[PDB]
Design a protein around this nucleic acid. Structure first.
Lengths: 74, 104, 328, 93, 97, 78, 97, 80, 105, 93
DNA sequence: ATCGATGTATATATCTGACACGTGCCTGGAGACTAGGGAGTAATCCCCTTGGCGGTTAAAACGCGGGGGACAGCGCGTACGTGCGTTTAAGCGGTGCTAGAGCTGTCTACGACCAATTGAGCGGCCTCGGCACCGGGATTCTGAT
DNA sequence: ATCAGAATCCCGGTGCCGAGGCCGCTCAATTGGTCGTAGACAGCTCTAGCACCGCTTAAACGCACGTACGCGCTGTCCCCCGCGTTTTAACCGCCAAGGGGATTACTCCCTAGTCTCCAGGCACGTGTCAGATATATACATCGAT
């Protein structure tokens, strides 16, 4: 399934995943198309913060849903 | 693991830790001390090359030449005061002319 | 044996006993009544006409009755104002904010009558966050001119002292509730009296301020991690806190969102900052630094005027640098 | 003879601050001679500070107070601060 | 046509404060050094760069001197430098007694 | 030899310093200042070369003279 | 009565003061100066009573050297009276800030 | 403490100039020298205090001021 | 005698200097000619001053040497002044030195 | 608690030059702080000539060429001679 | 011019104190003896400096002409010096308080040495792209009008 | 001021060359790994820094006077600047030389180390002679009468 990642800056990416994929493989693929440092990336799903090794199926985000990205400063 | 990677340096910690022992700067050396010292030298050679790169674009050049370091140093008033005694090869001086010599 | 000043707005009168006490070298309760009649005649324009008549120079602070003579002449004229307001004359506006000439009088009146001993404001351990240092009268009133605030905006001070920066801001705009957090002890013990008298000195002069509280405790307590993340406008005097105290403020500033504007003495971030792959950790990647104009005719101990630097949390630059690494 | 220099390490630090800039072979030898000279001033004072307390070890503490003597006002404020973090980072590792 | 006296000189400054090249040729300066080294020892061979280092010094010492000399003459309401000034400027540094 | 240091070359140096108008007795003054200065350097330069049991004044011996003078030089392999 | 001509008094001080060795700045006003500058670098510092005599000695012997090298300049500009564009001159030539 | 820099009097600076050989002082020198003496002392004391903080003491001996002037280039004989 | 000082005919202690070259970290190995040749040079410079102070003290007709004399010793010399041009002597004083045009006409 | 000096040695040197003269304790502690300063230039110069020639020793040849550099013209020319006499007089004895 | 007295030079005596001389007491100088290790010299080495030709081509050198500038001086208005009265504020020496500087105590974690393994660093290969150069164009002052 | 008149930017082309990747081979950097000894806290103690304070008095201070000196201006006399012609030597290319620096080697004799011996130097100790104060002449000089 494909998901939508909406940031604080108004920019929203169109990123394509599997329903089983971990956020770490997503945060690696966020490093593909955006190049933003994942160690300074911070993702939120609806009050449930995405952890690296955790999946989508841990969080059960539905297809074509909306995420939240925060730019954390290490 | 190196010992620069274990602290995030780019300068070596091997070469510095040896040179405190070849010099007889003291008898024995504390083990976190060559780390601290290589932290400083990195910051100073990231200070010069910062002021070098800005003033090198103004001549629309790509590489850094010894005229560009001379314009990086005598302009900055905190590196001038450190490098006060030192002449730099191929340098030249700042473009500056007195007030009374300009015509009417 | 006291002296009474009748309230022009109908509140409780302020009574000062004889002999009139001395607070410091240039602000005492005897001369304070001279300015009190001077600024309250600026409040009621009909009251100003009553003291233009028959008030001659010849009254001195040494005599009790002669100081009482202008005070008894003031008390007769307030009864003329209150009978005038019962007729067709409209009363004076109560829910307005005090002007800077009246914010001059009220805050110093709160500074004098609450803070009895200013020498106790100087009993601290130096080179520490316990170092006490206050702000000038113009520069906070300069921020009233130059910086815009609303109700979603919330002005919270870090190390307020007796808190007159919040007092000069909570009287200025309408933020919903203010905090003045105080790690120092003795100006916080005066902040209990600074809170009581000032809420009462907006009763006697009859103007409005915003909701405020000067709080004692730790600003580095871990409750205030998110409470700073709830704040819009943060004032801080970071001249001598210590940079690891400022680094733990940089820990609490990693959780602040958009639009935060910090006005500070020592820069967290340089004016000539530049983003590169060496200063990814530095704080100037997200906020711009601009220097507010320091006061004309104000010489500090060094010789340069006191510089408070305006910040603005603006995360525009950080993605742009990340975009301009793809570019070209 | 296989001689040593800092010619490669400055070139890495140049790419951290300017990727689109190189450095020629004349103004490399200045930055080589530079770091050979600032190291002798600092490791000179750590000799001088140890004898005055009649100790015989350069700890990490003398370098911290050799730098606060030897560099100017503003520049020593960052460099001491930049040094402590690197020791701090070294302590977890 | 004809220039005013002193108009070229304000261009000769701007030409020379933008350049880097050595203002005293290579060859007579080298034959000067081999004079003075002869009074200390006979048959002294110089490396090629060991005369370059003297020329980077002896220029950049004299170029520093006329900067300090020209501060003196403006201080005395003149424009023209004169040999009382070099005898002054070298004295305040303590390089002369 | 010292005569070989010309008249316009000293006029070329003084234009770099910012001098606008030069008198006429500078030209035997500035020859005199220079001839002093090398007798401080080369005398120290030779004394390193005496000690190394050599006859060939290397580039380093001029640099170590100028360091000791307090006139430190960058860019010749310090 | 009697009057000395202007200048003949000060010439008699210069001969008088250049022979004496006592400290020309008084003892105690100077000590409230050193503790004030030292106040803004670290608080609660106790000075030995021999270290305060060090600062008084080294700060005269700097300033006497300043007025010797002031006075070469004011004579150089054909004056006799020293003026603050001499003191700002001499510190520029020695390389100070 | 505040403003002891007026404690260096007007006849004090007058005495110093006569030792150098000044025959004739102007009137504006008295505000210059109170600036020259302050800046010179801010570099001596800053270094000497920094020696004190390394030794973990609170007392500034006479052998700290001499090690401040030696590094400064003004070597002082007579105090050890 | 058994002393290394009298075997060379010196005053300054040649045994002490051989210690101070070692516990100073000047170099590792100290050659045999190093303390003896050095301690002679120290003796010559100090005897050079006390001669020239003694010529300036007895012309002020006093018994001991006071530090006003040593200032007059160095500053009236050519080659001691070039060595000691970066020395402040405590309680010395300066020379009698009045310029040309300051004398009265 | 030992605190050494060069104090007793100047009494020998003073009387062999002006035997009818004394010296105060003020100007004693100048001459104690003079020899300690002339030492650490000369002994501090052989530290460089040892390592500028990649050596580890200090002969009486470095000490001769440390005096050549430091002392001015006519004073250096005697002090080398006065020293080398005392090498040879130590040698033959 | 010589009073003139003022400041300074030299000289008187004397009580204070600051060396100068003695005790003996204690860690360093001296001997010597043994082990190892850096240094001296030889031997060759292959570079790199001295040397000197030969022609080009800028750059130094000669000279003269015009004028802006330094030099001597006057005028004149004022600011700095000398002195007399007046008034703080150092300087003394006095006494107490105590913080802390300095010394020893007493064990100890930190650093060094030895040995083990190997990956980063350096020298020599290629090679491109940046400036050097070229000869062409717009722009910018200089001086005469 | 407004033209005009060379200067110099600045460029659009290209051509050598030196910097930036690339190779690979060795030796310094990391590893344990055990140790010994310098260093850190602890306790103690007197040291002098500090506080302070009354008591005389030298030392600043305020001011009136006035005169010599900074300062502005004038000019006038001539020295530097600018330009144009004429000549010398720097400069590049050069090639051949050969001395001296540089590395290897080989071994020796000097230095360190250790245990040993003692006495010179150091701090106390009492005693004393140079000096400074206190005054008293002796000189001589600076500006007026």
């Amino acid at each position: 399934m494909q998901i939508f990642v909406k940031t604080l800056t108004g920019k929203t990416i169109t990123l394509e995943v599997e329903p089983s994929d971990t956020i770490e493989n997503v945060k690696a693929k966020i490093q593909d198309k955006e190049g933003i440092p994942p160690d300074q990336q911070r993702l939120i799903f609806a009050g449930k913060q995405l952890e690296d090794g955790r999946t989508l199926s841990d969080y059960n985000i539905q297809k074509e849903s909306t995420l939240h990205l925060v730019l954390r400063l290490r | 693991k190196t010992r620069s990677s274990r602290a995030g340096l780019q300068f070596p910690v091997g070469r510095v830790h040896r040179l405190l022992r070849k010099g007889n700067y003291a008898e024995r050396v504390g083990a976190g001390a060559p780390v601290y010292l290589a932290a400083v030298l990195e910051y100073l050679t990231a200070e010069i090359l910062e002021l070098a790169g800005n003033a090198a674009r103004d001549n629309k050049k790509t590489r850094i030449i010894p005229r560009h370091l001379q314009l990086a140093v005598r302009n900055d008033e905190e590196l001038n005061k450190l490098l006060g005694r030192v002449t730099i090869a191929q340098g030249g001086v700042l473009p500056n002319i007195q007030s009374v010599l300009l015509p009417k | 044996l006291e002296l009474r000043l009748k309230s022009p707005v109908g509140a409780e009168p302020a009574v000062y006993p004889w002999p009139l006490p001395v607070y410091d070298k240039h602000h005492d309760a005897a001369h304070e009544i001279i300015e009190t009649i001077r600024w309250v005649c600026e409040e009621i324009p009909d009251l100003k006409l009553a003291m233009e008549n028959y008030v001659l120079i010849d009254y001195d602070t040494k005599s009790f009755e002669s100081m009482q003579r202008l005070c008894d002449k003031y008390n007769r004229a307030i009864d003329s104002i209150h009978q005038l307001w019962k007729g067709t004359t409209q009363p004076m506006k109560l829910n307005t904010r005090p002007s800077t000439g009246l914010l001059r009088h009220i805050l110093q009146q709160v500074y004098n009558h609450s803070v009895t001993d200013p020498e106790k404001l100087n009993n601290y351990e130096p080179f520490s966050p316990e170092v006490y240092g206050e702000t000038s009268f113009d520069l906070v009133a300069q921020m009233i001119d130059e910086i815009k605030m609303t109700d979603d905006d919330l002005f919270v001070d870090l190390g307020s002292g007796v808190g007159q920066v919040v007092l000069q801001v909570a009287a200025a705009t309408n933020c919903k509730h203010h905090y003045g957090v105080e790690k120092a002890d003795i100006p916080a013990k005066y902040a209990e009296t600074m809170d009581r008298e000032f809420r009462k000195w907006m009763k006697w002069y009859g103007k409005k301020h915003a909701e405020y509280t000067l709080e004692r405790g730790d600003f580095l307590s871990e409750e205030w991690r998110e409470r700073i993340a709830n704040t819009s406008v943060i004032f801080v005097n970071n001249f001598a806190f210590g940079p690891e105290v400022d680094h733990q403020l940089k820990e609490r500033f990693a959780n602040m969102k958009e639009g935060g504007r910090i006005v500070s003495s020592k820069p967290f971030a340089p004016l000539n900052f530049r983003i590169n792959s060496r200063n990814l950790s530095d704080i100037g990647t997200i906020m711009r630094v601009v220097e507010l104009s320091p006061l004309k005719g104000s010489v500090s101990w060094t010789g340069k005027p006191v510089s408070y630097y305006l910040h603005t949390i603006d995360r525009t630059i950080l993605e742009n640098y990340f975009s301009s690494l793809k570019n070209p | 003879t296989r001689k040593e220099s800092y010619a490669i390490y400055v070139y890495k630090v140049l790419k951290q601050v300017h990727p689109d800039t190189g450095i020629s072979s004349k103004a490399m030898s200045i930055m080589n001679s530079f770091v050979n000279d600032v190291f002798e001033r600092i490791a000179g004072e750590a000799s001088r500070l140890a004898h005055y307390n009649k100790r015989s070890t350069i700890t990490s503490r003398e370098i911290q107070t050799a730098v606060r003597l030897l560099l100017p006002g503003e520049l020593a404020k960052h460099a001491v601060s930049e040094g402590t973090k690197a020791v701090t980072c070294y302590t977890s590792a | 046509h004809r220039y005013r006296p002193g108009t070229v000189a304000l261009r000769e400054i701007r030409r020379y404060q933008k350049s880097t090249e050595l203002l005293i040729r290579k060859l007579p300066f080298q034959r000067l050094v081999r004079e003075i080294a002869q009074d200390f020892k006979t048959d002294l061979r110089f490396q090629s760069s060991a005369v370059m280092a003297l020329q980077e010094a002896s220029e950049a010492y004299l170029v520093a001197l006329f900067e300090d000399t020209n501060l003196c003459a403006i201080h005395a309401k003149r424009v023209t430098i004169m040999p009382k000034d070099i005898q002054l400027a070298r004295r305040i540094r303590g390089e002369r007694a | 030899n010292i005569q070989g240091i010309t008249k316009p070359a000293i006029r070329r140096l003084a234009r770099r310093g910012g001098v606008k108008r030069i008198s006429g007795l500078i030209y035997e003054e500035t020859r005199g200042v220079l001839k002093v200065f090398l007798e401080n350097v080369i005398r120290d330069a030779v004394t390193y070369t005496e000690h190394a049991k050599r006859k060939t004044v290397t580039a380093m011996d001029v640099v170590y003279a100028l360091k000791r003078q307090g006139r430190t030089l960058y860019g010749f392999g310090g």
